[PDB]
Write a protein that binds this ligand. Structure first.
Ligand SMILES: Cc1ccc2cc(CC3CCN(C(=O)c4c5ccccc5cc5ccccc45)CC3)ccc2n1
Ligand SMILES: Cc1ccc2cc(CC3CCN(C(=O)c4c5ccccc5cc5ccccc45)CC3)ccc2n1
Lengths: 694, 694
């Protein structure tokens, strides 16, 4: 017992595995539920400081496999796990789900065979994934591992013999490895007959059993660990499309551990905990040179967070738990349940304070969440303090996060107007390699930013099942040689694919001072997904194939411009080339203005390419009711889908809208939502009466 | 008429648009069906030189929209197209489909408004896509365009007026643009009242109509072209997952044209025809410096083919047509129809001649298709001359293509054992940028090669609907700093996703001299998709978590090795450190051999991680019947799916296998296929009798 004379018992002594975990710079597996209780309690204090919270608000129940491999709940002492993988079913009353929400926590036990993955950990991890998926509840994975388990048939180690070329000189070589009758019997005696594959021969009187394959008695030495890893990689790939999947990296995550981090997509990395494949030491041995310094050089946050593999970093395990808890506050309690409405002090019914100007540089986050000033807080489009930014360390040209719109949770994509710099590090493996600083123009899609956009869209759709708003403001894609070679077309195409797959309301809104040109429009147009998509443009937005400078260059050339001088200039209508020189700069300006006049939201409305033209200060009020209306209608489309079984979206919506009283304006979002909410149970009777099916 | 006195009529004069197309370095749209006839005829000559072919073997029928926008067939003169998009329905008797196969060809008319995309071309392209998708037939797109159409309200050009700050000095500035009552009436007179959005004011007696927005009378000037582009981008994204989509780039492909190339995935680029977004000239104007030289520098084959955006290059339009024709020979006639069996001179019933050795470097293509030698042709695993390689210019570490196995078409993925070099060009935009040569070790997955692998898997699955064989031979993923920063984990994860989505038989086979370690195994394991996947390892293959050098480093350390010297060396059993120095090199070799003995196919079989261990020379015969058996069983699973409506794969297969006579060995592939083929109609009666449903 160390230390003696403490006020309460030494938990690290009561369970020494707690101390092993601590010595490896991580929380002990069995202590993680407590971090979830601490975080859930903080969630309440930050929401309503006055809430009197008891212990029944949070329940953690360890899951273990029964006699038939069926998962059941247990109340046992920490450290009684016979396998290196552990899981808990958590039932917590949160501000979004005050009656309770459920999720599973799977975790490696770093103190059980170094957190390595053997077939039993793999089988259990897969069974927990399936348990969560069947129930539709989120699956949190806590990664603290050594990757697949590695072994040797340690029983053949003291038994094997070597058939030397010349016994007197061992360095002259050897022919094969073998077992004697003594070795063969030793295995027979311990029922380890299946440990080797032998072939009998007689060499100079001696009966030797030539080892042809070493199998081993102990399960979990090689290929079976790779099979199991594959199973859990496929399991996680499938779970990402089905339930909310998140992973917290606490202590190393190696090999399968690294793929699991990525396969679950959503990841929080604790500072100083690497995400690696082959470690630095092993790589140096392969390269035959001392190339790398640490595993952190290969998979630290300066790699993974900058990569976009790590969505967020965490200062310590509790910080990471707190971030999982916060991320989950935006996500339905289970698959196909409505998005969690959380109304705060920031009511839907106010104008937007922060407005961008053309002459002044701004941070797009100010338009999203607002900004503090000396005169006071300038509210943004979304609920004060609801902007939870993710992928913040990668492709900083796009801003992605979750937010709330008068309570409604949604995914937000904004455009960083400021030039973004990235520091591509020097390759240690190449002596003729130096670090390079890459500057990327604002409002221009690059391979990395287009990749981040598609990724964000997918991550909002799968598991999160959130509506989305893209505050669309791009000049186009980078068409230069470097960016074209770096496959910009591939990443731009992923955006289209992500939108095609989207299953919740989408809102594309070109903000004030905003623009959407050429390929940038193409890739985000509501016809990619007419069922979910909708486009809006601010009265101060611009959009066209080209920008006024390009439109002019192609369509208002020198001849057209001189004919304009002949029409408009009394002096112009040998001596003329002189007036031409004087007029051209202002005439260039006239043509730029002529072009710009086609790029207005009024032409967008007239040409029916946007649902409505909007006023920024009035967007919070508009978007709130539009999304609230749309969430109600989507619910009714889904209930109708079960009934009829076969009909188009248009047929379903037309039918739902035919149930609205004659007095209801189908174009009034506030009225339509108000009516639906006043009649959910009356609409339920309507749908139940429709069960007149054959 | 130029030239005079020709033997037959001057086609370029009869239709001058043919000459315009020619002057732009491309085939005239209406001449493309003839290239398809020429190619289809070549297909026959290369298959059976003795075939007497007539003209009814090939039928091309132009599709045009009727009065109600419904596509119908027409026989009209070339060049009567009122829109810049043209389509043909082709019905061709090919060696795979001798009774005929159908597909649509959509193409831009480079001679119609520079091949630009207006709303009518977009609406038609979408209608053709839908026509092909509804029918399940392939959609070939021939790209020769200027991207979205760009315009201005050319009627406002001679009418507009400018409100000068001071009329005497024009360069002092202007306030706004306006129309006079004369201008307003001019528009009123031509029913172009809707061309502008004005606001009346009176300035110093004059009634001016302030232009607030220029809309225009002519459709297809701006945003409506971007809407249409979006529609066709989404349409193509959807078509790739539904039907076989291929694109041939003949003459430039700009903006939406470039995205269409990528969205359809499968692309052949004609040498010298660029795939661009913003052109070089425009980019130089944005950058304010003469950075780029040509559009080919941005989107030529040295970009797109090296990128993997272009799957193949073509020397001229006929070469590209011939490659589409050849690619299609592997693809079903329509969606959900069986893969086209084409048996050639190379019967299934022979051993594999080309066998790799450990001491000799080989080209993996030799194992796939065989190789010519002085002694004669060494046959490979697949049918002689059936290897059609794709993505050949990108990530050369993986070899991807289509092949035939005794007639059966399938996707093939092999590993390039030789070190691959890539030349990353110097960025013209960066003066402190030089070209870099990147060497990539063989049998190691890098970001690019992992991306190519996932891509190939997807491209085989979607549209092609082909079975697959991965000749798995990777040491692992590159875990170094550069490759980890370049997101190797993301691309490795795409492999898993591509396999999860796979709907046709998969065969993973570790070939002779081959290996599969750590993360390389994880990502390709049959548990990712138990329904389709199956693993095999050659008797000369190796597989484990680590390689013998790593296994030794971790599990057979210094102490274990000295205890082994104490056991095995009579001399070893101050003076001992000397014998230790002498013994260690051979003892290191003993430990390397001890490890290697666990890495055998026999342990893989014993641990149940492979379906069977195989002998390479006998693989063609094994794989032929295994795939032929599996194609027959898959067919029966599908017919059963319609009947019962609800049951697992295992329940379906167990039921199908219960119909086999008692004498049939379920493990004999040749017998099982022979029985199914002898009883398709008897099995059809069985399934029809199962329609006893309520
Ligand atoms: C590295 C980098 C930096 C900024 C970029 C900006 C864009 C947006 C494009 C630029 C080109 N473009 C234009 O309207 C445009 C121009 C836009 C601004 C200035 C000059 C322009 C000249 C053009 C000449 C012909 C056609 C178009 C021109 C459409 C919008 C596209 C790619 C960019 N790449
Ligand atoms: C740039 C590059 C080049 C080759 C690469 C090869 C691999 C394959 C790996 C290499 C590491 N590995 C080993 O079995 C291995 C070793 C393999 C060969 C030589 C030395 C090794 C030392 C190791 C020390 C500890 C653990 C493993 C070691 C598993 C297989 C992985 C990454 C590679 N990256």
């Amino acid at each position: 017992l160390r230390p003696i004379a403490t006020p309460y018992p030494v938990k690290e002594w009561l369970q020494p595995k707690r101390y092993k975990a601590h010595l490896m710079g991580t929380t002990y597996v069995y202590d993680f539920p407590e971090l979830f209780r601490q975080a859930s309690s903080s969630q309440w204090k930050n929401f309503s400081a006055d809430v009197k919270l008891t212990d029944d608000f949070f329940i953690s129940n360890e899951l273990i496999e029964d006699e038939n491999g069926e998962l059941t709940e247990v109340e046992r002492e920490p450290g009684a796990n016979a396998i290196g993988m552990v899981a808990f079913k958590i039932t917590v009353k949160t501000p979004e789900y005050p009656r309770g929400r459920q999720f599973v926590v799977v975790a490696n036990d770093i103190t059980f065979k170094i957190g390595s993955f053997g077939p039993q950990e793999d089988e259990f991890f897969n069974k927990v994934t399936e348990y969560a998926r069947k129930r539709g509840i989120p699956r949190i994975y806590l990664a603290a591992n050594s990757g697949a388990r590695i072994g040797m048939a340690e029983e053949i180690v003291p038994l094997f013999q070597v058939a030397w070329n010349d016994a007197a000189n061992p360095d002259k070589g050897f022919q094969y490895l073998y077992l004697t009758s003594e070795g063969m019997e030793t295995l027979k005696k311990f029922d380890k007959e299946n440990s080797v594959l032998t072939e009998r021969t007689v060499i100079n009187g001696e009966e030797r059993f030539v080892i042809k394959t070493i199998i081993g008695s102990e399960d979990g030495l090689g290929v079976e660990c790779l099979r199991g890893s594959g199973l859990i990689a496929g399991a996680t790939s499938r779970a990402y499309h089905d339930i909310f999947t998140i992973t917290l990296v606490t202590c190393r995550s190696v090999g399968i551990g690294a793929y699991l981090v990525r396969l679950g997509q959503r990841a929080i990395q604790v500072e100083g905990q690497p995400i690696i494949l082959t470690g630095a030491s092993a790589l140096n041995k392969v390269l035959g040179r001392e190339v790398y310094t640490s595993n952190l050089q290969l998979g630290g946050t300066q790699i993974m967070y900058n990569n976009g593999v790590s969505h967020l970093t965490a200062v310590d395990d509790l910080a990471g738990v707190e971030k999982i808890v916060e991320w989950m506050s935006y996500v339905p309690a289970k698959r196909n349940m409505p998005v969690p409405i959380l109304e705060t002090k920031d009511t839907w019914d106010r104008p937007v304070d922060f407005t961008p100007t053309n002459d002044e540089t701004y941070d797009v986050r100010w338009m999203i969440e607002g900004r503090e000033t000396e005169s006071g807080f300038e509210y943004g489009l979304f609920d004060k303090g609801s902007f939870f930014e993710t992928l913040s360390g990668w492709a900083k040209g796009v801003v992605v996060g979750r937010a709330r719109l008068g309570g409604i949770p949604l995914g937000v994509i904004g455009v960083e107007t400021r030039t973004v710099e990235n520091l591509i590090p020097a390759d240690p493996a190449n002596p003729n390699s130096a670090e390079t600083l890459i500057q990327q123009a604002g409002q221009v899609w690059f391979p990395n930013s287009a990749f981040k956009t598609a990724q964000a869209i997918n991550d909002f759709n799968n598991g999160e099942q959130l509506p989305m708003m893209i505050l669309a403001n791009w000049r186009g894609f980078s068409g230069g040689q470097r960016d074209m070679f770096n496959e910009v077309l591939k990443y731009g195409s992923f955006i289209v694919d992500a939108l095609v797959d989207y299953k919740q309301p989408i809102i594309i809104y070109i903000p004030p001072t905003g623009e959407l040109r050429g390929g940038s429009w193409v890739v985000v147009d509501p016809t990619i997904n007419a069922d979910q998509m909708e486009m809006y443009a601010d009265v101060n937005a611009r959009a066209g194939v080209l920008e006024p400078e390009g439109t002019v260059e192609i369509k208002f050339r020198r001849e057209k411009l001189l004919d304009t001088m002949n029409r408009l200039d009394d002096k112009y209508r040998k001596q003329l080339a002189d007036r031409e020189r004087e007029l051209l700069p202002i005439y260039g300006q006239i043509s730029l203005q002529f072009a710009d006049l086609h790029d207005r939201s009024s032409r967008m409305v007239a040409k029916g390419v946007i649902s409505k033209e909007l006023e920024w200060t009035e967007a919070r009020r508009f978007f709130f009711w539009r999304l609230r209306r749309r969430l109600n209608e989507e619910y009714l489309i889904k209930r109708l889908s079960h009934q009829v079984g076969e009909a188009s979206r248009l047929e379903k919506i037309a039918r739902i809208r035919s149930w609205y009283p004659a007095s209801v304006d189908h174009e009034d979002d506030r009225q339509v939502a108000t009516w639906i909410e006043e009649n959910y149970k009356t609409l339920d009777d309507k749908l139940k009466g429709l069960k007149l099916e054959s």
